[PDB]
Homo-oligomer: A and B are copies of this chain.
């Protein structure tokens, strides 16, 4: 309970015991903030929703879709090329 209050003061879940961050994501979606919505969705352990948000953003307003394809290749190997490259190249983004 001491953790379900913190997450509700930060405005990630509305009041109640039904803690599943759906309304916040869509409120962000038509608020006009795509990248932050992607970050929150990924933090809630779901890639595919982030892909949906990113391609939908790519529909409106050319850099988003390639980044979606980049985040598509997630790897957990101890010597993954994705790990090393995306670690060294992270600082280049804006």
**Which residues in A have some Cβ–Cβ distance to B below 8 Å?**
47, 51, 55, 58, 62-63, 65-70, 72-75, 80-82, 84-86, 89, 92-94
Contacts and interface: CB of A to CB of B under 8 A. Distances in A.
Q: Which residue of A68, A72, A86 has the most chain B CB atoms within 10 A of its CB atom?
A: A72
Contact of A73 (B51, B62, B82, B94): B82
21 contacts: A58-B92, A62-B63, A62-B94, A65-B89, A65-B92, A65-B93, A66-B93, A68-B89, A69-B73, A69-B89, A70-B72, A72-B81, A72-B82, A72-B84, A72-B85, A73-B73, A73-B74, A73-B75, A73-B82, A73-B85, A73-B86
A69 B72 CA distance: 10
